[PDB]
Amino acid sequence: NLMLALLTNFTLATLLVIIAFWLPQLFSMKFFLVAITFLLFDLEIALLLPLPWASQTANLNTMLTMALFLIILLAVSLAYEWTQKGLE
Amino acid sequence: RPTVRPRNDVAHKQLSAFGEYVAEILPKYVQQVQVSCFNELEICIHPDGVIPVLTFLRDHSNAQFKSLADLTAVDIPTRQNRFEIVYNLLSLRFNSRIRVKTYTDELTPIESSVPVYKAANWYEREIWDMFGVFFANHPDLRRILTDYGFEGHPFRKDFPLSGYVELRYDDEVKRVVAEPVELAQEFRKFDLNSPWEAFPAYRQPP
Amino acid sequence: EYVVAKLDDLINWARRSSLWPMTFGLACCAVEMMHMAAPRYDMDRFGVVFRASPRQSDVMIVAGTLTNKMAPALRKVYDQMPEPRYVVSMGSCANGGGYYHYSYSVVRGCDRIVPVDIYVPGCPPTAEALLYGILQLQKKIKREKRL
Amino acid sequence: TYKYVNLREPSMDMKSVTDRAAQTLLWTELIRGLGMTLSYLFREPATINYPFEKGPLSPRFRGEHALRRYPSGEERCIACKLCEAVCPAQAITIEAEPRADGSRRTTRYDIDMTKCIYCGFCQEACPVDAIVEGPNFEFSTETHEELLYNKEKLLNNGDKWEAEIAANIQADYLYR
Amino acid sequence: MINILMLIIPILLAVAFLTLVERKVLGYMQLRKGPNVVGPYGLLQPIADAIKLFIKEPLRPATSSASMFILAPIMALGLALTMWIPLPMPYPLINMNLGVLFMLAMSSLAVYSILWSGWASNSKYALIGALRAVAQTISYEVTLAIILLSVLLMSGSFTLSTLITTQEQMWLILPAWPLAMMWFISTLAETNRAPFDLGPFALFFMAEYANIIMMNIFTAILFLGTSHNPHMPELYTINFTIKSLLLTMSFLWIRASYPRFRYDQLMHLLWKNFLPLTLALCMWHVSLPILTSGIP
Amino acid sequence: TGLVGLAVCETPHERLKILYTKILDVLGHIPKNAAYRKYTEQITNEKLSMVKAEPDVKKLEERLQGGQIEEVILQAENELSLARKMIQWKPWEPLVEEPPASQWKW
Amino acid sequence: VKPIFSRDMNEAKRRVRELYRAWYREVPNTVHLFQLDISVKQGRDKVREMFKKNAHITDPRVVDLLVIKGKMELEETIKVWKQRTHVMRFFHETEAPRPKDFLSKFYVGHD
Amino acid sequence: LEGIKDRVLYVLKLYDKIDPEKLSVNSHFMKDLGLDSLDQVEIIMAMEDEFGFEIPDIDAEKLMCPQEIVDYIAD
Ligand SMILES: NC(=O)c1ccc[n+]([C@@H]2O[C@H](COP(=O)([O-])OP(=O)(O)OC[C@H]3O[C@@H](n4cnc5c(N)ncnc54)[C@H](OP(=O)(O)O)[C@@H]3O)[C@@H](O)[C@H]2O)c1
Ligand code: SF4
Ligand code: SF4
Ligand code: SF4
């Protein structure tokens, strides 16, 4: 069971907190541009995720031109990051 | 002499030329007294103009000093005029050390050396801290070596070594560190001063 | 009855095993405190860890001279410390002002700011003598909370 | 004298450019820097555990103060106030009174450990060689009162170290 | 189902007994002696740190905002321990339908552990430094997904059990020569304190050092293998542990040998320099199964 | 080739000649009876003769500098500022300020 | 004239007035930003007793130096500086404090 | 100006170290009321914040009476 496996880890993690809790008795907007680019790149990663699991039944010649195409534009988005990104 | 003498005088006459050269200009505004002893030159300056003396020695065709590096002050209560701010200057191109002194009591403000020398402002803060001499037209006059809740000026010979506010208790108040307590351990005042005069020629007639 | 007496020593053994000191670089003493890291004389991972940190550390070594400017500064560090805290006044300046003392700025005794449990008398406190300060601290922990 | 720190362009053309680019493309010099600590790990560490092993010292070393005495009884300290005035910390205090009849040797003799920056000046200024600095490390107290030395007594209790002092002073007369 | 407890209790001991390795192996690098007084070779110290911090050490919170601060260590320890479940090993506990997707997911959610700690403190002084620590982890997770896919596109599906079978004769270090160099650096971003560094505070140590072993094991699956042997589980168990231990030495190697890269120039190593390099190798790894037949 | 200082070593001759001829005129505006003009002029005229005789030689730069032309150009650059400050504030020409109190010996 | 200082006689008095306004506005601000300590009203009473000891005025030279010092010890709060309720505190907390009388001081025996 | 004397008198009487009935209108704060050189001018600073106008150092020296202060308040 996956449900039994996950819940056992969290319940033991909660118990460790109580041990320390119960027993003893006596600005800058330049960071934002980095965070946004993380999200926009990971969505291109999300489109490029199926590649090892997808390419099994589909035609290779039709895929080859389209598979590289996403990575090329992923570099063009980084090419726009070279024309003055900032001090970061 | 082999071990008794440190160095024979040879450059003393060469350094005495500086004692004439600056004095050849002869300003009552600047020059006054020129003293030269033990391969070193000492000049004291009239309070009215200190900046024009410091612009001199800086650059100049005959002698190039540039570095107006180290800055001291003397506390002495014998004279009618109390403090004596002493400038120690060094040359890199010329390789010589000359001294600039002030004779004024300087409880009243004195002209600053900030426009001529960049690092002079940090030393000027120390003189206002320890001695209490204000510099006119000074940028950022802030306390460095003194405490934030310190009264008076810590170096002046008028008050004791221990001070007035020095001991800091904690005791009764949970967070506030104490200040008004004044008592300290007894510093033994030594009265060791030798009878008979130490050296001839230094004796002054009353 | 027997289990009560033996369990108390086990908690005391935990502090006898490891002690994390504060790295105060406020002295010439602090250079000798860096000789505790120097391999020839080591308490490093024998008990001492040089990670320090203002909150996680159990021990704080007041290294040498303290001025009236640092008197409120060192006090707030002591409040951030956990309840099992031991303060070592390593150096003659920390004991009661080795030099200076009668001076205006230097605080006498350190106990006027922060209470001291272990005193180390040495100016250049030799690493050999510094090894006693930690070993005595481990020996001093004997009994805590009877009832 | 001049030595020069600047390399002044190590790369020129083709062969000299590629190897300077190779260290920045991958790492190489970081892997070479990894090898420095690698051999440093294998070689034996110089470590001394204090409760069993002891560190190196010298015949002349200054620690905790202890005043010596003559081989046939008698306190070696003559009371001068000599060591009092030389003391840069003013840790040592001395008030002297005549001992019973004839002899005049001390009454008050306190050396502060709250003060004292350890010079060996009091060892040097002493003409009779009373305060001799012994190889001492062990001193740890709960209070200032327990730390600052009383009227001789604990200083005279340095007999446990005076056997070493007598051996160390034999390397001191006609210095080294 | 008893095996889950046989993958938490010996694992919590492995994070505990790291304290020996993290300053004795690091010690000989710095020519200093580590643990020696406490035990015979200092074996009593790792368990002694637990008695010190858990029971006796009290709490002094800055504000304690109802649910938070006493919830962040649960997310820290919980996500670090759940990462052990999808691990292939000789035999995995409850094998997922897709392996590596679960591995990347629980690591991307492990960013929250350093996020909620920044929200725990009321002061503005701490949160600016806290967001900077998020930036160290969030940025490298972009590349971590790319370098993973290039290894997968060479051979095998997302399942971690298939990654052992594909390494039968030769290791994956040789075909993925520049990609293996990336996993030495990219893993150190997740609070390892080697290229960049920022009661319940003690619980973060038990979670952060747990991820260090986790990245050591995960590198020894994607790049190491040597042999499988289904008939003999004895030969695989010993040989896997030695390979993982050698990578643990390299993790402590960077911590001692090399200074911090600066936060600004961490974004010059990555993004400016690494992201054009990783994608160019990703472009190369798309063509590889098409140029020569290589499909699972 | 470049100097060790922040000031860029630029190949420029007669640049030293312009600045040294400019400062001579400034000295002959207000002070005339003063010794400041009478002493500084003969040093500058001695230096100008070395520039005219030696054409771009390192030996000319070695005379009373020995740190290339870049260091010698800095000596001329602040010379105009020093002469203008001496002309503005009267000290060399006039001497009438009060004498100090009679005490010097410590 | 000699020496200048900053102001001449009558001008020096109005420099104290400008200094008084700047310090009067900071004592309500140094409760929320700093600490509660005692009181806002009692903090303003500490201002008036400080200027009473300084009240003499015989020469502008003495007055001008008090302005520069007044723009320093009372400036230790405006630009936000560390004190932690220990520095810049003028009033005695642990004072006995002693009184001036021939019956009170003589009973304790001092000097 | 209409309704200016009523706004200034309400703030002045409510303030500490001042008589509520003895001193009102035309009478000087330093001469008739009985206040120090720094204390009298400090009361004028509190009235400036309530009205909503900043007062210069030059104009503060001349003003003392509330009747004279009402004329200076108008802008
Ligand atoms: N605000 C109020 O509560 C209030 C109001 C009105 C009057 N008062 C008066 O003010 C006083 C307040 O004192 P407190 O309550 O603050 O003191 P406390 O905290 O109880 O401290 C007393 C200490 O003395 C020790 N002690 C006392 N009797 C002992 C015994 N028989 N054996 C061993 N150890 C003993 C205890 O040590 P162990 O813990 O190690 O045993 C304890 O640490 C009271 O005496 C009360 O009359 C208080
Ligand atoms: S005790 Fe000695 S070594 Fe230590 S801080 Fe003081 S002067 Fe320096
Ligand atoms: S210790 Fe030596 S110098 Fe000092 S009083 Fe005794 S005999 Fe004299
Ligand atoms: S060692 Fe120095 S400071 Fe100590 S008692 Fe002797 S003279 Fe005084």
Ligand 2, atom 6: closest residue by C-alpha: C93
Task: Take residue D90 and report the two structure tokens written for it.
Answer: 């003013």
Ligand 2 pocket, mutate which of C29, C88, C89, C108 (most atoms under 8 A from CB)? C29
Residue B71, Cβ density class (10 Å: 0-12 exposed, 13-18 middle, ≥19 buried): buried
Residue C92 Cα to ligand 2 midpoint, Å, equals 6
Tell me if E242 sits within 8 A of E51, measured CB to CB. no
Full strand arrangement of the beta sheet holding B41-45: B33-36, B41-45, B97-102, B83-90, B67-75
H39 annotated active-site = no
Tell me if C37 sits within 8 A of D51, measured CB to CB. no
Ligand 4, atom 7: closest residue by C-alpha: D87
Give the residue from chain B lying closest to G63, CA to CA. B108
Q: Count up the domains in chain G and report the number.
A: 1
Tell me if E249 sits within 8 A of E243, measured CB to CB. no
Count the alpha carbons within 13 Å of G62 in the hemisphere toward its beta carbon. Answer: 6
CB under 8 A, 24+ apart: contacts of A41-46: A41/A74, A41/A77, A41/E142, A42/E142, A42/E145, A44/A70, A44/A73, A44/A74, A44/A77, A45/E142, A45/E145, A45/E146
- CATH number for C1-147: choose from 3.40.640.10, 3.40.50.12280, 3.40.50.300, 3.30.70.60: 3.40.50.12280
Using CA of residue D9, residue D13, residue D19, residue D22, what is the dihedral sign?
positive
The residues near D33 (Cβ < 8 Å, ≥ 6 apart) are E257, E258
CB-CB neighbors (< 8 A) of A55 in chain E: 153, 289, 295
- Can you tell me the distance from the alpha carbon of B88 to that of B70, in angstroms, rounded to the nearest whole number? 5
Task: Indicate the DSSP class of residue B19.
Answer: H
Task: Take residue F73 and report the two structure tokens written for it.
Answer: 């150009």
- Can you tell me the distance from the alpha carbon of B61 to that of F75, in angstroms, rounded to the nearest whole number? 8
- Can you tell me the distance from the alpha carbon of D129 to that of E181, in angstroms, rounded to the nearest whole number? 70
Nearest to E161 by CA among E22, E42, E296, E25: E296
| C-alpha R_g of chain A | 23
Question: What CATH number has the domain spanning A6-83?
Answer: 1.20.58.1610
- Can you tell me the distance from the alpha carbon of B85 to that of B97, in angstroms, rounded to the nearest whole number? 17
- Can you tell me the distance from the alpha carbon of G54 to that of G63, in angstroms, rounded to the nearest whole number? 9
Alpha carbon D56 to its chain's center = 12
Mutate one of A1, A6, A37, A41 to test the E interface: name it (highest E CB count within 10 A): A41
Q: Which amino acid would we find at residue G2?
A: K
Q: How many CB atoms lie within 10 A of CB A43?
A: 9
The residues near B204 (Cβ < 8 Å, ≥ 6 apart) are F105
CB under 8 A, 24+ apart: contacts of D29-37: D30/E258, D33/E257, D33/E258, D34/E253, D34/E257, D36/E257, D37/E29, D37/E253, D37/E256, D37/E257
Nearest to E25 by CA among D36, C18, D38: D38
Interface membership of G87 toward C (CB under 8 Å): yes
CB-CB neighbors (< 8 A) of C42 in chain D: 47-49
Interface membership of F105 toward B (CB under 8 Å): yes
C70 C-beta closer than 6 A to ligand 2: no
Q: Which amino acid would we find at residue A47?
A: L
Give the residue from chain B lying closest to D89, CA to CA. B187
Tell me if B26 sits within 8 A of B38, measured CB to CB. no
> Nearest 5°: CA angle at C97, between C95 and C100?
170
Task: Take residue D115 and report the two structure tokens written for it.
Answer: 């003060």
CATH number at residue D71: 3.30.70.3270
Q: Which amino acid would we find at residue B139?
A: P
CB-CB neighbors (< 8 A) of G3 in chain B: 47, 108-109
**Subunits that touch chain C (at least 3 Cβ pairs < 8 angstroms)?**
B, D, E, G
Pocket of ligand 4 (CB under 6 A): D 86-89, 91-92, 111, 116-122
3-state DSSP of E83-124? CCCCCCCCCCCCCCCCCHHHHHHHHHCCCHHHHHHHHHCCCH
Q: Which amino acid would we find at residue C146?
A: R
Min Cα separation C147/chain D (Å): 25
> Nearest 5°: CA angle at G17, between G11 and G20?
145
Tell me if E147 sits within 8 A of E285, measured CB to CB. no
CA A71 → CA B169, E176, E183, distances in Å? 69, 19, 21
- Can you tell me the distance from the alpha carbon of C125 to that of C33, in angstroms, rounded to the nearest whole number? 8
Is C110 annotated to bind a ligand? Reply is no
**β partners of residue B33:** B44
Min Cα separation D43/chain C (Å): 13
The residues near H43 (Cβ < 8 Å, ≥ 6 apart) are H12, H15, H18, H29, H35
Task: Take residue C87 and report the two structure tokens written for it.
Answer: 């303060």
Q: Identify the domain containing residue H48 by its residue range.
A: 3-75
Task: Take residue B152 and report the two structure tokens written for it.
Answer: 């008076």
The residues near E190 (Cβ < 8 Å, ≥ 6 apart) are E107, E110, E137, E140, E211, E215
G108 membership: H or E segment, kind and range = helix G105-108
**Main-chain phi, psi angles of B42, to 5 degrees:** -130, 125
- For ligand 3, what atom is nearest to the CA of residue D96? 5
What is the residue-wise DSSP string for C11-34? HHHHHHH-B-------SSHHHHHT
Ligand 2, atom 2: closest residue by C-alpha: C123
Give the residue from chain B lying closest to G68, CA to CA. B134
- Taking an 8 Å cut-off on Cβ atoms, the answer to whether E54 and A19 are in contact is yes
Interface membership of D11 toward B (CB under 8 Å): no
3-state helix, strand and coil shares in percent for chain F, rounded to the nearest 5: 55, 0, 45
What is the residue-wise DSSP string for E180-235? HHHHHHHGGGTT-SSS----HHHHHHHHHHHHHHHHHHHHHHHT--S---SS-HHH
Give the residue from chain C lying closest to B189, CA to CA. C102
Nearest to C65 by CA among C37, C21, C31: C31
Residue B113, Cβ density class (10 Å: 0-12 exposed, 13-18 middle, ≥19 buried): buried
D130 C-beta closer than 6 A to ligand 3: yes
**Which residue, chain included where needed, has tokens 């409120």?**
C72
Residue C121 Cα to ligand 3 midpoint, Å, equals 22
The residues near H51 (Cβ < 8 Å, ≥ 6 apart) are H7, H8, H73
Q: Which amino acid would we find at residue D114?
A: T
Nearest to C131 by CA among C116, C120, C140, C117: C120
Considering the candidates H6, H19, H32, H36, report the single residue annotated as catalytic: H36
Alpha carbon B22 to its chain's center = 22
**Main-chain phi, psi angles of D109, to 5 degrees:** -155, 85
Give the residue from chain C lying closest to D142, CA to CA. C117
Is the bond preceding G3 in cis, omega lying within 30 degrees of 0?
A: yes
CA E2 → CA E5, E6, E77, E93, F93, distances in Å? 6, 7, 20, 11, 103
D148 C-beta closer than 6 A to ligand 3: no
Min Cα separation C30/chain G (Å): 25
> Nearest 5°: CA angle at E130, between E129 and E134?
115
CA H72 → CA C2, G17, G22, H29, distances in Å? 89, 19, 22, 16
E143 — alpha (psi -120 to 50), left (phi > 0) or beta?
A: alpha
- Can you tell me the distance from the alpha carbon of G45 to that of G91, in angstroms, rounded to the nearest whole number? 11
CA G47 → CA G26, G74, H33, distances in Å? 11, 10, 21
D79 C-beta closer than 6 A to ligand 3: yes
The residues near G92 (Cβ < 8 Å, ≥ 6 apart) are B179, B180
**Which residue, chain included where needed, has tokens 């327990």?**
D146
**CB-closest option in A2, A16, A56 to E77:** A16
The residues near E146 (Cβ < 8 Å, ≥ 6 apart) are A45, E278, E279, E282
Tell me if D134 sits within 8 A of D120, measured CB to CB. no
Strands (E), E14-62: none
- Can you tell me the distance from the alpha carbon of E288 to that of E294, in angstroms, rounded to the nearest whole number? 8
Task: Indicate the DSSP class of residue C67.
Answer: B
- Taking an 8 Å cut-off on Cβ atoms, the answer to whether G84 and C71 are in contact is no
B44 membership: H or E segment, kind and range = strand B41-45
Q: Count up the domains in chain H and report the number.
A: 1
The residues near E145 (Cβ < 8 Å, ≥ 6 apart) are A42, A45, A49, E104
The residues near H11 (Cβ < 8 Å, ≥ 6 apart) are H46, H47, H50
Interface membership of G53 toward C (CB under 8 Å): no
Q: What do you get for the CA distance between the two ends of chain G, in Å? A: 46
3-state secondary structure of C106: strand
Task: Take residue C65 and report the two structure tokens written for it.
Answer: 């001279």
Q: Identify the domain containing residue D104 by its residue range.
A: 64-175
β-pairing, B135-136 with B33-36?
Answer: unpaired
Q: Would you state the torsion angle of the CA atoms of residues F12, F13, F15, F21, taken in this order, to the nearest 10 degrees?
A: 170
Nearest to G27 by CA among G14, G39, G18: G39
CATH number at residue H74: 1.10.1200.10
3-state secondary structure of E269: helix
Do A and F touch, 3+ Cβ pairs within 8 Å? The answer is no
Q: Would you state the torsion angle of the CA atoms of residues D113, D119, D123, D127, taken in this order, to the nearest 10 degrees?
A: -120
β-pairing, C59-61 with C86-90?
Answer: parallel
> Nearest 5°: CA angle at E213, between E211 and E216?
110
Using CA of residue H49, residue H52, residue H58, residue H60, what is the dihedral sign?
negative
Domain borders along chain A are 6-83
Please name the method used to determine this structure. cryo-EM
C128 membership: H or E segment, kind and range = helix C127-140
Nearest to E60 by CA among C19, C82, C73: C82
CB under 8 A, 24+ apart: contacts of A6-9: A6/E82, A6/E85, A8/E4, A8/E5, A8/E8, A9/E4, A9/E8, A9/E78, A9/E81, A9/E82, A9/E85
Entry field: residues in chain D: 176
- Can you tell me the distance from the alpha carbon of F6 to that of F70, in angstroms, rounded to the nearest whole number? 10
The residues near C101 (Cβ < 8 Å, ≥ 6 apart) are B185, C108, D89, D114, D115
What is the residue-wise DSSP string for G5-17? -S--THHHHHHHH
Give me the residues of A, 11-70, that contact E with CB < 8 A: 12-14, 16-17, 19-21, 23-24, 26-28, 31, 34-35, 38, 41-42, 45, 48-49, 51-53, 55-56, 60, 64, 67-68
Tell me if C83 sits within 8 A of C119, measured CB to CB. no
**β partners of residue B136:** B111
- Can you tell me the distance from the alpha carbon of B185 to that of B162, in angstroms, rounded to the nearest whole number? 9
Task: Take residue C13 and report the two structure tokens written for it.
Answer: 């053994």
Task: Take residue B136 and report the two structure tokens written for it.
Answer: 């006119």
Interface membership of E41 toward D (CB under 8 Å): no
What is the residue-wise DSSP string for C28-48? SHHHHHTTTTSTTS--BTTTB
Interface membership of C53 toward E (CB under 8 Å): no
State the ligand closest to the CA atom of D105.
Answer: 3
Task: Indicate the DSSP class of residue H55.
Answer: P
**CB-closest option in C95, C108, C128 to D55:** C128
Tell me if B103 sits within 8 A of B44, measured CB to CB. yes
A64 membership: H or E segment, kind and range = helix A60-79
**CB-closest option in E28, E181, E253 to D45:** E28
β-pairing, B67-75 with B83-90?
Answer: antiparallel
Which residues does chain E break after (C to N > 2.5 Å)? 198
The residues near D147 (Cβ < 8 Å, ≥ 6 apart) are C95, C119, C121, D113, D114, D139, D141
| C-alpha R_g of chain F | 18
**Which residue, chain included where needed, has tokens 């020093």?**
F82
- Can you tell me the distance from the alpha carbon of C59 to that of C16, in angstroms, rounded to the nearest whole number? 12
Q: How many CB atoms lie within 10 A of CB D82?
A: 16
